[PDB]
Amino acid sequence: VTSVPGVYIEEDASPAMSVSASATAVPLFVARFTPLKPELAGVITRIGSWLDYTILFDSNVPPTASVALRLYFQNGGGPCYLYPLEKADDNGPLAALPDLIDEVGEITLLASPDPDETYRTAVYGALAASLDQHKGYFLLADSVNGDAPSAVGGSAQVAVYYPNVEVPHTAPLSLPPSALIAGVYGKTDGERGVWKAPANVVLNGVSDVSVRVTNEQQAELNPKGINVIRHFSDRGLVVWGSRTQKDDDDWRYIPVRRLFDAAERDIKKALQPMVFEPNSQLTWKRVQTAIDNYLYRLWQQGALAGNKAEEAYFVRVGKGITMTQDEINQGKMIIQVGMAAVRPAEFIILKFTQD
Amino acid sequence: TTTYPGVYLSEDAVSSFSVNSAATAVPLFAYDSENTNTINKPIQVFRN
Amino acid sequence: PAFAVSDDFQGKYNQGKALNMIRTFSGQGTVVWGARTLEDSDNWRYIPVR
């Protein structure tokens, strides 16, 4: 390698890496629209605000897609995507939908602001298969009446908000609340973070609910877990309840589901540069450290429910532990990692005593 | 399965479980079949 | 590369023999992908160990 005496120059190259967090926001909407140019017919388009929506698209006169989308920006900011399609049973682009979401790496939430039931349930079954290979989605849904929809029967990532919300327009028109409830997830992760359940947040700009729910049938609907939009006298309308669908003690809460969904997506994006490196011992201690310094920063900002000890993570990557010799030959690595998330506090009980 | 190269991830299989407390008081009452000043519906549900 | 291959067309050509496709990602581009030799025996795979 060295023949002429001279002086040779050489550096040490290494893929040494660290992990940084992205945002859990900016969904796409699959309602019907009216594009202005023919290349905007069937492709995903990034929308930054309400201003550039008025340039690319239009507001028509009879027509609820332009009304349901401006209520998204009044609640919480952030960009959003949209996928215009015209026919509900057009299973051409509906089959060609899930292989367009994967090429954009960010997509987290999923929604559909279209009013009727025949259009929404055709959508919810089209991309229902793309939820169980663990890439990181979390959709929203609405209920046509007092029970949950059956297009997605039992899954760890859905959320149902029962009573639909109306809005005045020149008779006031109703609106399925899956549109404007996506914007209220964009405020909670701003100041409070991911690990806070959005309940006490106040809906920003509405007249009234369509049907008035009371506390005696709140008792029935809070099991078989579906959420509810409530009305109060002093503070107006407010969202209420933060429970997911399937009710084992594994994941019954929205933030405990969404905390593990965001912690995986940040470490999986940064291990992708190191995917063909040798399986020696100095690679093991460099990966185990960059995961250790990610959960420790997240622990000391109040998101892992551990006490003043260290017991919130046990990431280990060794060869005697967690592996053995014969799966090195069919090249593998095993990352046993585990957290201890925090639960929301509901049902506060006082129990006064005399002494 | 382990078809293509890349980064895979699995999660836990089973979690903990525990029992939920009770309801302890839901009564059904004794209507009378020959009664007149009432509804012919057999089963009524009253909440408050 | 002249073609865009897939994510899963790599999968059925990873056993038996070693097609070792050339695939372009986002960010890093036109990179090679997969280092496998022609046999599948647990002594002689993995081109760098040869």
The residue of chain A with its CA nearest to that of C6 is: A99
CB pair distance less than 8 Å for A249 and B12: no
Pick the closest to residue A114 from A124, A129, A106, A125 (CA basis). Answer: A124
Whether residue B7 and residue A216 make contact (CB cut-off 8 A), yes or no, is: no
Chain A residue at shortest CA distance from B13? A250
What 3 state SS string does C19-35 have?
CCCEECCCCCCCEECCC
A169 burial class (0-12, 13-18, 19+ CB within 10 angstroms)? Answer: exposed
Tokens representing A264 are 């995986």
**Phi, psi of A341, rounded to the nearest 5 degrees:** -75, 175
Q: Is B9 on the interface with A (CB under 8 A)?
A: yes
Experimental method: cryo-EM
CA distance A251 to A261: 12
The residues, any chain, with a CB within 8 Å of residue A104's CB and separated by 6 or more, are: A44, A81
Q: What is the DSSP letter of A166?
A: E
Classify the C-alpha dihedral A102-A108-A110-A113 as positive or negative: negative
Residue A264 DSSP one-character state: H
**CA–CA distance, B20 with C37 (Å, rounded to integer):** 58
Could you tell me which chains touch chain A, where touching means 3 or more CB pairs under 8 A?
B, C
C-alpha angle A170-A171-A174 in degrees, rounded to nearest 5: 100
A219 contacts: CB under 8 Å, gap ≥ 6: none
Backbone angles phi, psi at A139, to 5 degrees: -95, 170
Residue with tokens 């699959």: A30
In this structure, what token pair is assigned to residue A203? 């809906």
Q: Which of A248, A250, A334, A337 to mutate to test the interface with B (most CBs of B within 10 A)?
A: A250
C15 in helix, strand or coil?
A: coil
User: What are the DSSP calls for A101-146, one per residue?
Assistant: HTTSS---EEE----SHHHHHHHHTTSGGGGSS-S--EE-EE-SSS
Chain C contact partners (≥3 CB pairs within 8 A) = A, B
What are the distances in angstroms from CA A344 to CA A122, A198, A199, A334, A338?
A: 34, 10, 10, 32, 20
Closest-approach residue (CA) in chain A for B17: A249
Contacts of B14 in chain A (CB under 8 A): 250
When CB atoms are compared, the residue of B14, B16, B48 closest to A216 is B48
A280 Cβ under 8 Å from any chain C Cβ: no
Task: Using the structure block, give the residue that is written with the tokens 């990610």.
Answer: A294
Three-class secondary structure of residue A252 per DSSP: coil
CA C4 – CA C30 distance, rounded (Å) = 11
Task: Name the 3-class secondary structure at A165.
Answer: strand
| Best CA proximity match to A143, nearest among A80, A211, A92, A49 | A211
Instruction: Count the Cβ atoms, other than its own, within 10 Å of residue A114.
Output: 22
Sheet-wide strand order for A28-29? A45-47, A80-82, A28-29, A109-111, A138-139
Picking from A115, A334, A284, the residue whose alpha carbon sits closest to that of residue B8 is A334
Phi-psi region of A351 (alpha: psi -120 to 50; beta: other; left: phi over 0): left
Question: What is the enclosing helix (H) or strand (E) of A28?
Answer: strand A28-29
From chain B, the residues in CB contact with A216 under 8 A are 47-48
> How far from A189 is each of A24, A292, A296, C14, CA to CA, in Å?
7, 23, 19, 41
Distance from CA of A103 to the nearest CA of C (A): 9
Cβ distance B15 to A250 less than 8 Å, yes or no, reads yes
The amino acid at C27: G
- Measure the CA angle with vertex A235, ends A230 and A241; round to 5°: 35
**Interface test mutation site (partner A, options C39, C40, C42, max chain A beta carbons within 10 A):** C42
Question: Distance between CA A307 and CA A140 in Å, rounded?
Answer: 34
